[PDB]
Amino acid sequence: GTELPSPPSVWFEAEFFHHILHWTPIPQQSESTCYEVALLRYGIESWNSISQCSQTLSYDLTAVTLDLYHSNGYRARVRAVDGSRHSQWTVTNTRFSVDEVTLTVGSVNLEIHNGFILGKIQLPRPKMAPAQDTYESIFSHFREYEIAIRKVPGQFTFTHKKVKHEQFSLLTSGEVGEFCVQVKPSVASRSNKGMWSKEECISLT
Amino acid sequence: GTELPSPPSVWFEAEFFHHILHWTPIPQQSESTCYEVALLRYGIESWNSISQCSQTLSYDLTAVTLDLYHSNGYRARVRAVDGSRHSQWTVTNTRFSVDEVTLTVGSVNLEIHNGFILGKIQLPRPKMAPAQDTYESIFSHFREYEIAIRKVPGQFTFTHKKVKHEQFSLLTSGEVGEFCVQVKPSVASRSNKGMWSKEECISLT
Amino acid sequence: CTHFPGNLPNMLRDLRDAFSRVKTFFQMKDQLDNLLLKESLLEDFKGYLGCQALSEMIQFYLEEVMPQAENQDPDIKAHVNSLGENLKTLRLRLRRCHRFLPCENKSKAVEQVKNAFNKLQEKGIYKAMSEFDIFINYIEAYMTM
Amino acid sequence: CTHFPGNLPNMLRDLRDAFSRVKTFFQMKDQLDNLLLKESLLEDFKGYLGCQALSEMIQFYLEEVMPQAENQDPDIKAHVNSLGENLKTLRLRLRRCHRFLPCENKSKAVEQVKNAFNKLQEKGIYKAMSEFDIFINYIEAYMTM
Fold this sequence. Notes:
Chain A is mostly beta strands and about 200 residues long. Chain A has one helix spanning about 135-140; strands spanning about 10-15, 20-25, 35-40, 50-55, 60, 75-80, 85, 90, 100, 105-110, 115-120, 145-150, 160-165, 165-170, 180-185, 200-205. In chain A, strands 3, 4, 6, 7 and 8 form a five-stranded antiparallel β-sheet that branches. Chain A has a four-stranded mixed β-sheet with strand order 5-2-1-9, with no helix packed on it. Chain C has about 140 residues and is mainly alpha-helical. Chains A, B: One of its GO terms (biological process) is interleukin-10-mediated signaling pathway.
């Protein structure tokens, strides 16, 4: 009975230099309970307590994994603490590496031309990212982007286009109105899932 | 009986661009008999009669084997001819190649210094040799020379020295008189036999 | 091989996508934290022994590792063999286009010669042997480069 | 290997000198005049497949050719085996000093890894498999050069 339940599960959720640890609370958690988060760099048998007590279900581990893209990854564990008792540790099921990072774009700029609409994709430049590590620098080859284009006025429908450059063009066949765009990034050799960008529109008129 | 005996044997005897064919006469050879010499370049199934009749036991085949050092060698054959009858052909036992060439030097120059005698070895520059094919060019590495030194006045005795350069020096420890020298060449990687040079002497006084 | 303008990526994604199918099983199974595939192996892949190092590993995985795991736990014996295929499928594409895996490529001239030698038979043993000096001259020629 | 300042020549002379001992026998025996060891083989020795071409030939002679001749005519079965030795003796010296025969050289990192893997056993199958992505990242890294 004197036992304190361990977090049901611990997993990473990350984007380029935004490595957030996540976990499920123990059942029937009192408010005096918090979680101790620890870390381990694969290759070094050494667990490093990062936070001794966090009253939340997530934790930004970026700062302590800034060398993820030049490493073999990490392992993170969480345990419950209440008074002078603590649960067993609950470790991530898989080694967190660049393979578990969700690709995203920094933003999208749109300009209107003759029958062309010039599009430029701004890759993400997070703060926490050291200069030596730019998106292009890490993912130097095979960067692609799926594009979705919606017309307005109009219904919620999209034309899909596939590009392999941060820049692309859109044919304004001979229409007017607003044109909304969203892009999802990817790396041809990697299987990393990606996320659609916040739509970006432009009034042709 | 109507048979005409074939040359007992045919072999090459050569130095740098001086490829002489040789053979033993048939037994009891009349003077109206001569030898027909033929040639073959290894890789081409084709015998080429070089001389239809030669009343001698040797034949300079240089001119027709000027590409010996950039080839896989040759085969030569000889047969006896008298009136309208001729012997079977007698071919060389081995393919004549650069391996069957006797190395020799062009000459040796000697100068007298303090306690040193400067020696310079002149590699052979035969006429028949095309420019592209200099001794150094063919035997680019591992050229060595054995040197024999005789004192005069004195007896017929020699001091032996081993050099790896066309130039060498001789210690005149503190003696006078004439100093005769002879050199025999070789190629460290090749097993080609060599010949001692015509002695070259120099009056120190 | 079409100079491989760049058809390889799709093959690595194929390999990883195959691996993700067994990633959790083994990563939950492996509790040790030391690196097995040291970066010394990486340096080797970059050394002028790279090709040989890479061939050996692919061989190692396909012959020793995967066979021992696929069998030991049929649970994923399939999911793993699939990965194996993606691998062989990669190796094949790597050596069809020189530069990447020369060390697994047969010599053409050597092939024809072995055949011409077989097409001779009895006369072949004799001609190969009596051309030995040509052999040495080739070998020697080689070294001088 | 001492960078091989140049101890190889003495080894080629050793090889030829061995060959001269059987030169006449086979050269009197071989009556055909076509070249068996075409110069295409020479070009291969100069191509970036050189090492592989050279290894194959040495293997060819030592395994197929010499064994079939030494046996077929014991007359020189010795004189020939001797040549064989000079050959193996050469091959050995060629690969002890990289540059000449890299293709016959084992990878050190790959050796240690195979051993560390053997020193694990059960835990080894699991760690090699769960590091597969590191493997792919190495392979991929390789290609990008």
